Amino acid sequence: LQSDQVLETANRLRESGKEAEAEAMLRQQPPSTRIDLTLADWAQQRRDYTAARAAYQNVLTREPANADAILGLTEVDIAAGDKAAARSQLAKLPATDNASLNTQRRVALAQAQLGDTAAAQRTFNKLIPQAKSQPPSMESAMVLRDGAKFEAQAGDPTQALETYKDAMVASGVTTTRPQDNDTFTRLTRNDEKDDWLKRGVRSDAADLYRQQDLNVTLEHDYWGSSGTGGYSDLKAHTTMLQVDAPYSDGRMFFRSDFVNMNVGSFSTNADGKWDDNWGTCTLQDCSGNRSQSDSGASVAVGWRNDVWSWDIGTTPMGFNVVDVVGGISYSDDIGPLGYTVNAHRRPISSSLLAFGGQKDSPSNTGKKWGGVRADGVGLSLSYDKGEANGVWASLSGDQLTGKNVEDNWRVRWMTGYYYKVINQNNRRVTIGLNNMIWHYDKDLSGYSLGQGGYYSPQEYLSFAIPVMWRERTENWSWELGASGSWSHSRTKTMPRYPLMNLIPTDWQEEAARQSNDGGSSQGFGYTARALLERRVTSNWFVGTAIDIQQAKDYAPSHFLLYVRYSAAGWQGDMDLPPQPLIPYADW
């Protein structure tokens, strides 16, 4: 056909991006409707709405209600966001016929996004058995993958898993249908030479299988920080047990921790008496509580998915001060920028006084204080398409309050630019720059009565240069890196006992005469973090991680070991990076 030669002439111009214009000047003579539909599809692939509707009018001027044009109109209306117009256009579709599986799949998808699940289910129940009998190809693989996704969204995960297992035969991942979970996970592994459809099938099948599994983890981590014995010589142990069970689209988790806080003993020298900046010992010598240690247990329950997450729990029961923490989060995408808002209630685990609170010596006052809880909101912005760049930012503001402590509030701001030197599937090395600015209304770093004993700089500014190295193989997954930082702090002079209602009347004048001097300091800091994970058998995984914090921010170091149990059995690609259990207080 003469028109066929014209069409292929334009098809030999797709190398240049201006082939649409060339078709436009070529079709200045009456083009009938076949080339019009071809250029309408071309316009649909590149940009939408405006010219798509222009071509809609051009075809509809002299068309006998073509099914493809109307279907494209439905798709455009769904993209535009007009439910009524899209539904009307879908109803305008002609009666069902042979309708080669592609157009049926598009109509079923449009019905799925148009609130017609009661008809989309029937459409896909008719589409899948016929596609199964066909030999392996692209369209059959696409329709099988879309049916598996629809069944996953429908509610039944078993049918989606079966469809995903079958889809590999049509796509070309495997010649024979898998009959066991181990082969399924092994075929979900990534390959450096795969088509887009094959990559998508592997990714979504692996994600669905990981979501639909039972995991049990046990982790014990040793954390602490050097300091003066009695209130700051922190040496703490925590044991956490977590079980992740699938539920609807997301995963439900149950976490239970067991802490053991040991801060040492007072270095008494004045004949069984000590006079340190803790409690009210500087007004009168303290005696009786030479050893300071505590332990407790906590329970956490929550549910999360891709869109929004929430959790609820309590602070470790057994401590001097106990409170009910909580949190919630939401995530979405705006263009190329992703934002994750959240409102959280978290305690401070930097010290025993901040976390569970201490008790003053029975000789002087014998009163309980501490237990700082931060209730605030935060806004985080992320942007990453993942070729040679990455930028993230975050801002949060809390209201630091606690039992028998002075009220305080903070406004933190974190930002960072990370550059991926290697962007391989199994290897990722990132070098970038980090910036952090914090501001606290009141300096409560002292451990005296009325203060929270937590790092609260009035003005903070830190610049860090982190270097990362993420790599994985068949059985090993490790991460090694370091980050040197330069920080500048500036505190202000505050009275030693901001809240004067607890101190005795006799010591009131001397208490007022005592104040905590403020100062400014700057210096270089560094931090080193390493991770390791090894898959021993198909069900049990073991790993460990070491965190070293020397950034002058009084952050304690962390050394953790954990073992993960998988009920189903995962023989697929390892986690990049390995994912240890973050402590509940650190959330």
Ligand X SMILES: OC[C@H]1O[C@@H](O[C@H]2[C@H](O)[C@@H](O)[C@H](O[C@H]3[C@H](O)[C@@H](O)[C@H](O[C@H]4[C@H](O)[C@@H](O)[C@H](O)O[C@@H]4CO)O[C@@H]3CO)O[C@@H]2CO)[C@H](O)[C@@H](O)[C@@H]1O
Q: Looking only at residues 189 through 248 of this chain, which bind ligand X when binding is defined by CB under 6 A?
A: 195-196, 199
Q: Return all residues near 2 (Cβ < 8 A) that are at least 6 apart.
A: none
Q: What is the DSSP letter of 440?
A: B
Q: C-beta of 302: minimal distance to ligand X in Å?
A: 33
Calpha distance 393→415 (Å, rounded): 4
Rounded to 10 degrees, what is the CA torsion of 87, 90, 94, 99? Answer: -150
Find the shortest distance in angstroms from Cβ 105 to ligand X.
7
Nearer to ligand X, 106 or 367 (CB): 106
Smallest distance from the beta carbon of 194 to ligand X, in angstroms? 7
User: Interface with ligand X includes 47 (CB under 6 A)?
Assistant: no
**Shortest Cβ 117–ligand X spacing (Å):** 19
What contacts 104, CB < 8 A, 6 or more positions away?
Answer: 96, 123, 126, 127
Spatial contact of 169 and 162, defined as CB atoms under 8 Å apart: no
Q: Name which of 97 and 196 has its Cβ closer to ligand X.
A: 196
Cβ distance to ligand X smaller for residue 103 or 340? 103
Between helices 157-171 and 138-154, what is the axis angle to 10°?
170
Nearer to ligand X, 25 or 388 (CB): 388
Question: Nearer Cβ to ligand X, position 104 or 349?
Answer: 104
Give the residue with the Cβ less far from ligand X, 66 or 538: 66
- Quote the CA–CA distance of 238 and 220 in Å, as a whole number: 6
Task: Give the number of other Cβ atoms within 10 Å of residue 391's Cβ.
Answer: 15
Please report which helix (H) or strand (E) contains residue 182, including its range. Answer: helix 181-187
CB of 392 to ligand X, least distance (A): 21
Q: CB of residue 196 vs ligand X: minimum separation in angstroms?
A: 4
Tell me whether residue 62 or residue 199 sits nearer to ligand X (CB atom): 199
Scored b (16 or more CB within 10 A) or e, 46-61 reads eeeeebbbebbebbee
Distances (CA, A) of 87 to 75, 95, 310, 311, 326: 10, 15, 35, 38, 42
What b/e readout covers 322-361, taking b as 16+ CB neighbours within 10 angstroms?
bbebbbbbebeeeeeeeebebebbbbbbbbbbbbbbbbbb
What is the nearest approach in angstroms of ligand X to the Cβ of residue 138? 8
Strand, helix or coil at 469?
coil
102 vs 493 by CB, closer to ligand X: 102
Q: Under 8 Å CB-to-CB from 39, ≥6 apart: which residues?
A: 20, 23, 24, 27, 55
Tell which residue, 477, 583, 586, 572, has the closest CA to residue 202: 572
Q: How far is the CB of 58 from ligand X (least distance, A)?
A: 20
C-beta of 338 vs 525, nearer to ligand X: 338
Rounded Cα distance, 312 and 531, in Å: 28
- For residue 100, state whether it binds ligand X (rule: CB under 6 A): no
Beta bridge partners of 299: 256
Question: Of 527, 546, 535, which is closest to residue 479 (Cα–Cα)?
Answer: 546
Q: Which CB, 61 or 100, lies closer to ligand X? A: 100
- 42 vs 409, beta carbon nearer ligand X: 42
Which is closer to ligand X, CB of 180 or CB of 196? 196
Q: Which of 9, 50, 102, 424 touches ligand X by CB under 6 A?
A: 102
- Length of the chain in terms of residues written: 587
What is the spatial distance between Cα 43 and Cα 374, in angstroms, rounded to a whole number? 53
Q: How far is the CB of 18 from ligand X (least distance, A)?
A: 18
User: DSSP string of 200-215?
Assistant: HHHHHHHHHHHHSS-E
CA 395, chain centre distance (Å): 16
Binding to ligand X (CB under 6 A) within 159-198 occurs at 195-196
Q: State in angstroms the smallest separation of the CB of 580 from ligand X.
A: 30
CB-CB contact of 440 with 425 (8 Å): no
CA neighbor of 241 nearest in space, from 585, 584, 586, 587: 584
Instruction: Report the residue number whose CB is nearest to ligand X.
Output: 196
Q: Which is nearer to ligand X, 102 or 537 (CB)?
A: 102
Q: What is the spatial distance between Cα 192 and Cα 112, in angstroms, rounded to a whole number?
A: 33
Residue 106 in contact with ligand X, rule: CB under 6 A: yes
Those residues whose C-beta lies under 8 Å from the C-beta of residue 81, and which sit 6 or more positions away, are none
Count of chain residues binding ligand X (CB under 6 A):
5
Please, what is the minimum distance in Å from the beta carbon of residue 188 to ligand X?
A: 16
Q: Give the residue with the Cβ less far from ligand X, 143 or 444.
A: 143
Which of residues 21 and 41 has its CB atom nearest to ligand X in the complex?
41
- What residues make contact with ligand X under the rule CB under 6 A? 102, 106, 195-196, 199
